[PDB]
Amino acid sequence: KLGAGYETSAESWGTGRAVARIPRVPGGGTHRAGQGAFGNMCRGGGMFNPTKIWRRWGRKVNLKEKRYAVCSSIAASGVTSLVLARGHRISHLKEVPLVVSNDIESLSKTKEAVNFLVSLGLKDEVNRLVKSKKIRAGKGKMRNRKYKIRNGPLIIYENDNGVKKAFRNIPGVDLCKVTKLNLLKLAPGGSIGRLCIWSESAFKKLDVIYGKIHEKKVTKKNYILPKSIVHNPDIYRIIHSDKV
Amino acid sequence: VAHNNVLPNVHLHKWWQHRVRVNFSKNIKKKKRRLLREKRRKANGGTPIEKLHPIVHCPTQRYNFRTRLGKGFTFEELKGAGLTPRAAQTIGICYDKRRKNRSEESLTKNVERLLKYKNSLVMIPLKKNKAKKGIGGIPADADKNTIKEFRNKKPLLSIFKKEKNTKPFYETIEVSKIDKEFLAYKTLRRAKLAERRKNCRQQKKDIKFKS
Amino acid sequence: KFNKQKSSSRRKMRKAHFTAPAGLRRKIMSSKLSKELRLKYKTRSLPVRKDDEVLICRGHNHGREGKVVKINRKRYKIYVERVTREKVNGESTFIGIHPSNVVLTKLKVDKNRKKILDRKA
Amino acid sequence: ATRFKKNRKKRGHVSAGHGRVGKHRKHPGGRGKAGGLHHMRINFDKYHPGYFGKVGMRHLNLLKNRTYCPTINVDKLWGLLPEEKKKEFSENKDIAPVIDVTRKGYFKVLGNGKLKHNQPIVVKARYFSSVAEKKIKAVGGQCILVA
RNA sequence: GAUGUUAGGAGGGCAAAUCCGCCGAAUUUAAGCAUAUAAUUAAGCGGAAGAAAAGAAAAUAACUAUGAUUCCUUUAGUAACGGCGAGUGAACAAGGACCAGCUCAAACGGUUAAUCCUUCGUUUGGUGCAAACCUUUCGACGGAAUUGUCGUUGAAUUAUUCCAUGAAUGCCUUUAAUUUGAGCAAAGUGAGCAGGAAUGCUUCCCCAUAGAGGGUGAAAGGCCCAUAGUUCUUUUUAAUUUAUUCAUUGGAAUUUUUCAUGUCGAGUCGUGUUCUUUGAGAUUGGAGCACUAAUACGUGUGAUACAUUUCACAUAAAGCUAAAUAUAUGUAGGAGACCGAUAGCAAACAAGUACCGUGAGGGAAAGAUGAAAUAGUACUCAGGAAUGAGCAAUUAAAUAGUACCUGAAAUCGUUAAGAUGGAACGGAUUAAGAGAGAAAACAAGUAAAGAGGGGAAUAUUCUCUUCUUUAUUAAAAGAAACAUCAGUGAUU
RNA sequence: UCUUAACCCACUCGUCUUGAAACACGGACCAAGGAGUCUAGCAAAUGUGCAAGUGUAUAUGAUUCUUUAAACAUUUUACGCAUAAUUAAUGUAAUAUGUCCAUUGUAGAUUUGUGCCCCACUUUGCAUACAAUACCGGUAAGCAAAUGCUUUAUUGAGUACGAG
RNA sequence: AUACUGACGUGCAAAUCGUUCAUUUCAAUCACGUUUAGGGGCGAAAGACUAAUCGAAAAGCCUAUUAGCUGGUUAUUUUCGA
RNA sequence: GAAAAAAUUUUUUUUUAGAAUCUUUUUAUGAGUAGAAAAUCGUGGGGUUUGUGUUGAAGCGAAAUACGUGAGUUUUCGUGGAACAUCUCCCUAGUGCAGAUCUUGGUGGAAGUAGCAACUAUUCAAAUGAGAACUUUGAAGACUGAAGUGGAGAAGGGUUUCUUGUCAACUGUGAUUGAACAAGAGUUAGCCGCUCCUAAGGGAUAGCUGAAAAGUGUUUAAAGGGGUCCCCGUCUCAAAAGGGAA
RNA sequence: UGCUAUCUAGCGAAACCACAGCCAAGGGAACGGGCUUGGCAAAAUCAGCGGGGAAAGAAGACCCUGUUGAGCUUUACUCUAG
RNA sequence: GGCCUAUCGAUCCUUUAUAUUUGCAAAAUGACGUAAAUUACUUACUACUGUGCAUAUAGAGGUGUCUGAAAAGUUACCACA
RNA sequence: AGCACAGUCUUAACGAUGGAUGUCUUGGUUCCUACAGCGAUGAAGGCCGCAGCAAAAUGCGAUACGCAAUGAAAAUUGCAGUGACUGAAUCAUCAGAAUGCUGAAUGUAAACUACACCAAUUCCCUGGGAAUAGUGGUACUCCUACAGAAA
């Protein structure tokens, strides 16, 4: 609050009064009289720098960097080792770029969605997601932060035919539409890669978006995939190689 | 103040805490404007809510080659189109008295623009099923069939937007048509030098004419 | 969840629970219906009434069926026939039961309830 | 942000990392730019040479539109075409490009650099340097003054 | 012009966050201070609204020109002002949001002020249960009004085309939204274990378009409210559907052709002079005083005083008007990487309360039993009474007993142990006591025979084991002691 | 581990101060609170993306609308800073067409060769340092009718294939 | 309210006590009502007094005024160090 | 990429390294205020990850053959009765105290001490009660000494009055007392006052000023009354001690 | 001689307080309770007392310092009602 | 410039010098000059083009507390750091 | 039925004292969203009241912790009472009805229940019969209308 702790009267008789010289509340009778006043050390006195409404709250993150972060995060999800490393129970999955026929986009009952995840072989992961809801420690409970859950698979879809409502309400699942792929969802907590489930339509559309066989509005205009600094990172093969 | 660093210059010296405002409202305010305007368009019987505007050339030296939406077609442009101001106003063509067509090209270009909009539009009969020729040069009413089929069609709003100037700088000329004896720089400086004397003569002509 | 109209913030909800008026309080003293009745009426849950017969299935009396004595909307407590207990001074009072801890069997119809049962149907 | 700050590194040390002996007092020279010409004169001489006093003609409203005029050197002129077009002109002698300097938003053409010897070029612009006219002419091109 | 308790009406005060007029400082900055600065701020006083103010060119430009107002983005820390110090500081364009225009006055209309208003009345409706509202034309009788209301917006006139119009019969359908209140609302109160009591642990079941939030005797998707989802009903306002006949009065727009070329805000603008104010500089705006104009070929702008003059752009000295735009106030919602009872609103409590001050005013402290007090201390004994005790007694728990959660430290009690010749503790090293401990600080395996657990082979063979016991062999580990080296020394 | 001992040692901490154990000041005790922050604008450092550009502004657009007050998107010259400087200023403005070549030195990294590896020759000649020339704006001086001229002086926060 | 520079001086009191003393028909004393208000009032004048507050009252605000000056200015190890 | 030991050639036991800000090894070196840096460590919250909880969480008290140079970290037993971590990585901050004559709340030694001293001074017996130097009663002895601790009254206080209870706290000793606490109760006017009148004066009306707020009080009044169309003529408050029906 | 002081019964504070409390000399910020060297040093207490504790009070009022003030004066500088 | 070693002064401002250098913000002011031209809103071509103010450059007017505030006393009535 | 010196100091266990710590949280907070003026038709504000047993806080206004009406709808309870078998008890809604004295406060006043002046006023009954010293009105300024006075 703007005036916080300063709406007492202000007075300072102290020199020669045989007390410390910091301000005292004036007047008499009541216990608040003669008592230590405003200041960053006294009962009700207000902390030294208040927090204003005008902290530099946000940040203007840069378009080209954001795009690169999205491309790179999706690419990271592509690599099997990284998803496993990110801690998914992904052991029995057939392939990490997991693409399913567009009938997945038309799924429309939660049980079938669970059943589908089990059929894929993510049973252990589905178990961890159901299991992992807990009440967390500390002040959060009073601020509407009661449960903590861990991050489930990310369903990527081309256009709704049930999926958006249908896979929601299974703990820790996320859904996002392909055109508006989201860096926070692809890369939670600054971790890299995620267990991703793609529609075939989505998969085909992804390639269109970044400009192989470009389009008038789907493709991001004037934008290219960032070229790598290193062309091939197999350092041990280079060292192994005969000439070297 | 200390060493190499530039001199300080911050004008927060007169009381400024009582004068900040921080816009957390950007996205929500944008959403609100959109929602009201969309609601208004929905309300207004499927009509566009945008009004026609003339294209104009920008003021002064700085933007002499650029062209933008102005405010208000002028009386000459309406008359050339075949409309009268109140009538124009009813069909969303916006008027003014202030503009005056200084040069020929701008008048022709604007009457073509008005005509294109006019030719495009199709008019609802005012009291339903009572279609008539109508006043002021406003396009005549239409039947049920045309209207019904047209309402079902998408209303293409391209005319409201600013005209793109098509770039044509990458252009070609034959070498043997080039005239190499010209001195452009010389002409320019001489013209600047001779300006006062030319003004002096022009002023004398202007005096002569007025009598 | 999805509507923004109803607040989901904890403090506010809690306040609402404690400061609730009597009609609202009557509504949230509702009980699970027994299976035969559930089948009969096609209804999950009912607001409790005095002359009905409940079965207790949570708390230290979970073997007990019995008739409802008094319902207390001030204290959020229903009281039942033989869940008697002696107090310190040798005086018998009834043990309070909260509605979740009872499953309602036989319920006595009257015109107000009949209207509710038809409304549910 | 806060966790990295310098004061936490020195956190228990009496001066707060700001000198025991002289201590950090409020406003220790006087405010802002005050000490100029007098007690901080040496700083003002040594870091902002020309600072004090007035010089030259006054101008009552600049009205900056009038005098606007971005420059380009001739050096960059062929670069305003794409690559494929440039090659085509290099191959075919009979035609030359016109370049309208207005469309790319420049007003005056200046004379840095070397043009390709014996490609004529027609240059349309508002302003030219003396040097630029001579160079454009030297390669067999023409200058057209245009508003 | 007075006068009237004449008839009908109005203003006063409260509320201020945003909003509009005034009036108006200083602390301060300049390392002093006097001009500047603080600041056209604060205080003072007047006035409005759901927003206000501003607004329909006496504008800017000098271009290929723009074109009411406001706001945003911007120009710009720039032009500029300034002990040219400190410091201060615009405008035009440009990109947007929004986008809306107008009427008095002046002119014109006298074979007739065509206006306006109170009071009395009078009727075509529609809603509503009623109350009541809401439409509706038509007359009186007063007044008011020529010291100027009303119409018209140069004037007729041609062709074209519209809009009000009034009567008859007919016809008010389907949908789409939008916004209120409304309902209805998925699966387990299944074993066993430990617990006072699961929502715990297993395990066997399930639902989810609901695994948001809350309640419930410990963490509950399936115990409950609610939630997702829909089904209605409410607000208005789109689209869609049907009009058809007949009727006359009146008005409007272009278009021809004529003829008329009219008007345009004065003690005001301006100027001098002052003072103020400003970005405004031989004056930016205001203001006082003195002087005091011109009629549209006028007179006002075109940021340096002037003359003699072009040219561009405008039409002052009268009025109104939606939008965007603002909101630390009041009230209602919704929120949170916010605070957690010495914090956070001063204020989680009977807080602007108690209390203090003659008064203006100043102005606190103080949340938590337990699942349940519909468990709040029964009974006996000793007590005058407080209280205490109990073989007695609520509770899972009273060393949870209404000072009721947890219960730190300072401080102080009881017992035990030690110390004790004018400070006390301490450091570095050992000692004697007093406690604690086996995880390195001995003993693998093997056999006998009990108790468990597993894994495999194709309910029973094989095989791996942990605990117990009897006894029965390893071995290693550290410390000693002497000896051998090697390294570093001393000695005779 | 604690506990006393014993030998030997051992001055009240904080503090301002040339110099504190001080006959300098502050400290009876204990518990909790209690002090280099935030914004604006600027700088260098370093990180990161892009690169003669760069930032997508305000704002629009989206089957984006619990989260989302964020994320996403932006039909082939808006604005900032950069891309050129200089002079009070009208303003003027970078070698120069003999050639897609890119001013001259002296050191100087990297490379080629000779007589897979040290040399010593040669060979290319970065960065950078030090100079030198040209040329551009201002000013001189000389001339002067002109697109002003000049081999000469000077001056600039100038330039000589970009760096932001 | 003079003297005792007496009592008290962590008081019986933020001016009290004892004894001594000045004053008493007038420039006399008291009550109550009434008048004058802060760079102001009032003053048989001490810068006295204006509610324990006076060489500029009390209250709140401008205001967290301002201070080249005093005090304070919070975990460890490691490196270089005036 | 195999080294050793143990058994009884064949079985068993130990180890078997490749983390680049990292591992092996070598050598040099090590003072520090003002100051700078790096590396750690800890607290509130966040995202991410994978866990502890009623066979008892956090907290707290005492510790521990515990680990760390150290900040600290870890753990045992006891208390406790409900939530707690995150070192995987990293965002974020009102983040770490002995001191400020710091603030707030509590608390000691000083200490059973200074002190409970004005106002002539009390004694005996009885009653009540658990208990009487200071409650009540009687008897003495005393003092105040009509400028009174006596009657009345004013201002201020405000139920303090009275009866009946009565003793949690207070009544600076004690206390059965009480101006405390509790329960009821009590104030009666034509004549006593206020109430009416005017005074020092106050507030308004007319004007006039002033942005207004206010400053003025007949200064250009068509103004409230009495007679019966004439004559008087600012309104209003201001005395509980002046005037004043009984 | 009264009343206090005193002892008892009863009741019951505070200022102050780095830690504390025997000296000589020495040195040392030049007058130490602690430090070095000497003298020396034996529980617990009771009543006085004023040698010392550079005793208490209280950000020296004297003096000086501040580009802190204020009251006051003038033929200080700048103003200003009248 | 004075035999050598001393003999002195920023910014703003004023003041007077200098120039074939410039400005006064939509324009003009020598000059309808010189040629033409026709009867006119004609075409070329000219270093030199009103008053006043301002700049640029160069001196000079002065700051002796001399690297530059326009500044007298008093307090035994006094305050505070 | 014996034995311990006391004091002072230290240590440990168990206590007092105290309320820190941790844990909670019907409160604050900030932002966002939304509407947004009350008054002579008597406001805000203040008093004064009002319960069977009742102090404040709350609520309400002489019909007084509530009346009516609508929607829920069987109990409400400390005692006492009052209620169903749905205008009865309880809520919610809240439009009807009611809203003391004041307060701009406006008949003159004000530390007053003081004081004027003009209407006497009100109710019942379907044009009569009863009540009650009770109840209204009466500020300043203004505007339109009207009135009878003046030039």
Side-chain angles (χ1 to χ4, degrees):
Chain A
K1 184 169 294 181
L2 181 59
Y6 289 105
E7 296 195 308
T8 67
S9 188
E11 182 51 78
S12 303
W13 186 32
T15 302
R17 187 188 179 173
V19 287
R21 58 202 292 181
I22 197 168
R24 305 295 176 178
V25 176
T30 190
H31 292 177
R32 223 281 196 247
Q35 190 183 57
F38 48 82
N40 49 294
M41 70 299 280
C42 304
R43 181 181 173 106
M47 73 279 197
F48 86 98
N49 188 28
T51 301
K52 313 302 297 189
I53 58 170
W54 62 75
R55 286 205 70 198
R56 181 167 143 251
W57 299 107
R59 293 297 185 268
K60 192 178 188 181
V61 193
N62 306 313
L63 186 62
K64 287 175 178 159
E65 291 173 53
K66 292 191 295 180
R67 288 182 169 160
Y68 196 147
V70 172
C71 302
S72 55
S73 54
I74 294 168
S77 286
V79 185
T80 181
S81 302
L82 302 180
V83 185
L84 179 56
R86 202 257 175 235
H88 284 301
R89 302 297 193 264
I90 194 169
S91 308
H92 305 307
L93 188 59
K94 307 301 188 179
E95 183 55 86
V96 168
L98 177 62
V99 188
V100 188
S101 65
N102 301 311
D103 294 293
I104 190 181
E105 195 164 67
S106 299
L107 194 147
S108 63
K109 286 288 292 183
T110 46
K111 69 212 304 166
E112 292 197 64
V114 180
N115 198 258
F116 162 81
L117 297 171
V118 178
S119 190
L120 285 169
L122 303 173
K123 184 187 293 182
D124 293 67
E125 189 57 67
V126 173
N127 187 262
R128 182 175 74 115
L129 297 168
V130 180
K131 198 58 58 179
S132 52
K133 190 184 73 173
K134 285 187 180 299
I135 304 177
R136 86 275 199 88
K139 297 172 188 175
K141 298 188 303 301
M142 292 187 285
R143 301 191 182 173
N144 318 296
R145 304 198 285 250
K146 175 173 281 179
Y147 295 115
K148 191 268 185 284
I149 52 82
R150 307 188 197 150
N151 281 259
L154 175 62
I155 312 302
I156 298 170
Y157 77 100
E158 198 287 311
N159 268 293
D160 187 60
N161 289 284
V163 279
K164 201 179 86 181
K165 73 174 191 61
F167 264 73
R168 165 255 283 176
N169 198 40
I170 301 171
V173 182
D174 280 293
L175 295 106
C176 184
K177 211 168 82 177
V178 165
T179 51
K180 292 170 169 178
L181 281 163
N182 172 280
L183 190 276
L184 302 179
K185 287 289 183 182
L186 282 159
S191 66
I192 56 173
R194 191 167 178 179
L195 174 57
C196 305
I197 316 190
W198 306 66
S199 78
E200 179 280 311
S201 201
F203 210 63
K204 191 193 290 91
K205 183 156 284 183
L206 186 69
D207 199 58
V208 182
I209 290 174
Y210 288 98
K212 298 210 288 81
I213 63 172
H214 82 281
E215 200 288 305
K216 291 289 190 294
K217 285 185 178 291
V218 173
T219 304
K220 302 189 181 189
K221 205 174 179 180
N222 310 302
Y223 186 68
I224 46 78
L225 293 178
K227 305 306 301 182
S228 62
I229 300 176
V230 166
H231 182 239
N232 192 63
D234 196 339
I235 308 305
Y236 307 132
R237 192 182 314 189
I238 300 173
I239 295 172
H240 298 317
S241 80
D242 301 293
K243 191 193 303 294
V244 181
Chain B
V1 55
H3 47 83
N4 204 12
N5 304 286
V6 83
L7 311 99
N9 198 52
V10 180
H11 307 175
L12 293 175
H13 203 60
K14 54 185 62 176
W15 186 20
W16 71 292
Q17 293 200 59
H18 177 193
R19 206 53 39 75
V20 188
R21 65 179 185 149
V22 184
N23 295 356
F24 297 109
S25 46
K26 190 201 184 65
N27 282 349
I28 190 67
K29 210 184 209 198
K30 173 170 54 179
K31 203 188 303 177
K32 175 180 170 178
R33 294 190 295 263
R34 182 183 178 89
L35 202 65
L36 187 140
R37 65 188 171 241
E38 180 59 13
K39 177 181 167 64
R40 197 167 69 186
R41 179 158 57 204
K42 177 61 181 293
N44 205 359
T47 65
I49 59 85
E50 303 74 9
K51 278 80 181 295
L52 189 66
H53 292 274
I55 63 94
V56 297
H57 280 79
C58 301
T60 196
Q61 176 58 245
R62 188 170 170 84
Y63 300 117
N64 183 231
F65 56 84
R66 196 160 60 83
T67 179
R68 65 171 175 89
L69 298 177
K71 188 258 181 170
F73 293 93
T74 197
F75 193 88
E76 280 275 64
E77 303 168 321
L78 267 57
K79 186 53 176 284
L83 293 171
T84 191
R86 300 177 183 175
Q89 207 280 293
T90 272
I91 54 174
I93 301 172
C94 292
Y95 184 60
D96 212 288
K97 55 181 182 176
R98 279 172 171 77
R99 281 177 58 260
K100 42 184 158 181
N101 292 100
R102 194 74 70 179
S103 292
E104 187 170 292
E105 186 171 296
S106 295
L107 175 61
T108 59
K109 192 162 180 177
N110 286 335
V111 302
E112 168 184 63
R113 183 167 177 70
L114 289 167
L115 186 57
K116 187 174 177 179
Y117 177 86
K118 181 173 173 178
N119 192 252
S120 186
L121 78 97
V122 164
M123 170 55 92
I124 301 194
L126 192 70
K127 299 190 299 192
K128 283 286 183 67
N129 303 301
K130 288 168 192 76
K132 292 157 184 177
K133 291 175 277 184
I135 57 175
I138 303 169
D141 306 328
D143 57 86
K144 293 172 64 72
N145 298 350
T146 44
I147 296 182
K148 188 63 58 67
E149 298 184 306
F150 268 69
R151 282 192 186 277
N152 285 290
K153 206 172 186 70
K154 191 173 73 175
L156 195 59
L157 306 179
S158 304
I159 70 299
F160 292 109
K161 276 286 188 178
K162 194 182 300 187
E163 186 184 71
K164 297 185 293 183
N165 186 263
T166 308
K167 297 167 177 173
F169 75 92
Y170 37 92
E171 67 171 341
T172 308
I173 191 169
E174 298 185 67
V175 169
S176 52
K177 302 300 181 68
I178 300 177
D179 187 61
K180 64 182 178 63
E181 302 305 305
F182 193 64
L183 294 172
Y185 187 80
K186 180 169 190 68
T187 299
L188 202 153
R189 303 229 74 241
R190 287 174 61 71
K192 228 295 296 300
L193 190 62
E195 190 179 62
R196 193 163 74 140
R197 287 189 169 121
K198 291 180 183 294
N199 293 319
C200 208
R201 288 182 61 251
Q202 180 56 59
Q203 175 68 59
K204 291 184 180 297
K205 296 187 196 298
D206 292 313
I207 296 166
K208 189 178 187 181
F209 192 62
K210 197 167 195 176
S211 192
Chain C
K1 196 193 320 299
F2 290 109
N3 81 91
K4 301 169 73 71
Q5 190 61 64
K6 183 163 285 174
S7 45
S8 300
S9 50
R10 178 175 184 238
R11 171 187 170 199
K12 194 161 285 176
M13 185 55 207
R14 218 168 197 271
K15 184 188 173 67
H17 170 270
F18 283 117
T19 201
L24 186 54
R25 286 170 170 259
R26 182 269 192 166
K27 192 69 59 57
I28 68 172
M29 291 288 281
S30 292
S31 304
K32 189 164 195 168
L33 191 56
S34 190
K35 294 178 188 290
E36 178 189 74
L37 292 310
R38 186 171 189 263
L39 192 71
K40 184 179 179 180
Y41 290 124
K42 194 210 96 292
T43 297
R44 186 192 294 279
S45 175
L46 294 170
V48 72
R49 199 175 198 80
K50 172 170 178 180
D51 287 298
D52 297 348
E53 301 176 356
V54 289
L55 171 63
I56 301 178
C57 53
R58 276 266 71 79
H60 195 66
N61 295 93
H62 59 70
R64 296 291 192 84
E65 65 172 66
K67 190 173 182 181
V68 172
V69 186
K70 195 193 308 297
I71 63 172
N72 195 303
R73 300 180 182 130
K74 194 184 297 185
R75 295 179 172 232
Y76 296 131
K77 284 180 170 185
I78 72 173
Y79 294 103
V80 165
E81 187 265 304
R82 223 173 303 150
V83 292
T84 187
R85 160 182 171 69
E86 292 181 65
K87 306 195 301 155
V88 184
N89 308 150
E91 299 177 355
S92 295
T93 64
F94 303 96
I95 297 166
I97 305 165
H98 191 80
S100 55
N101 293 358
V102 277
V103 61
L104 179 67
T105 306
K106 187 178 179 68
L107 67 100
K108 189 263 171 63
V109 68
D110 184 57
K111 53 180 167 175
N112 204 39
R113 290 230 292 201
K114 185 62 168 66
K115 175 195 80 185
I116 298 174
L117 292 168
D118 201 292
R119 162 174 164 142
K120 260 71 179 77
Chain D
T2 43
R3 58 196 167 102
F4 287 100
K5 271 201 162 183
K6 186 205 189 190
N7 186 260
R8 290 196 183 283
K9 302 189 311 196
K10 302 294 169 55
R11 189 59 180 176
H13 281 271
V14 189
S15 66
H18 208 153
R20 186 184 295 259
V21 184
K23 306 185 180 301
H24 177 197
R25 291 278 168 79
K26 303 197 179 197
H27 295 130
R31 271 43 66 129
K33 298 203 279 62
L37 193 58
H38 302 277
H39 64 269
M40 297 200 280
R41 186 202 291 210
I42 182 163
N43 186 280
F44 273 77
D45 285 313
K46 192 167 180 174
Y47 291 97
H48 306 293
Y51 179 72
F52 299 89
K54 87 182 218 287
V55 65
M57 192 73 72
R58 298 162 63 229
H59 190 303
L60 308 314
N61 310 277
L62 217 298
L63 312 174
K64 297 200 176 70
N65 293 58
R66 298 182 181 180
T67 53
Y68 187 53
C69 47
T71 61
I72 43 169
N73 292 283
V74 288
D75 215 3
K76 298 187 76 177
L77 188 57
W78 290 89
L80 278 57
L81 287 173
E83 292 278 87
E84 183 77 299
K85 191 55 59 183
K86 176 178 60 181
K87 191 174 183 179
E88 192 170 66
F89 282 115
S90 188
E91 189 61 64
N92 195 330
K93 194 58 54 59
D94 285 356
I95 45 169
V98 191
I99 306 291
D100 183 353
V101 179
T102 64
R103 264 63 184 209
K104 296 303 301 182
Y106 301 115
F107 267 15
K108 185 164 192 181
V109 191
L110 300 180
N112 198 18
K114 194 207 85 179
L115 296 172
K116 181 169 167 57
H117 175 47
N118 314 303
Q119 290 293 127
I121 183 164
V122 181
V123 190
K124 276 182 174 180
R126 297 193 174 221
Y127 308 126
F128 288 92
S129 70
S130 42
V131 185
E133 178 149 65
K134 211 72 180 182
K135 287 190 171 179
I136 293 165
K137 193 177 298 303
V139 295
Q142 181 175 355
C143 298
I144 296 176
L145 299 179
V146 59

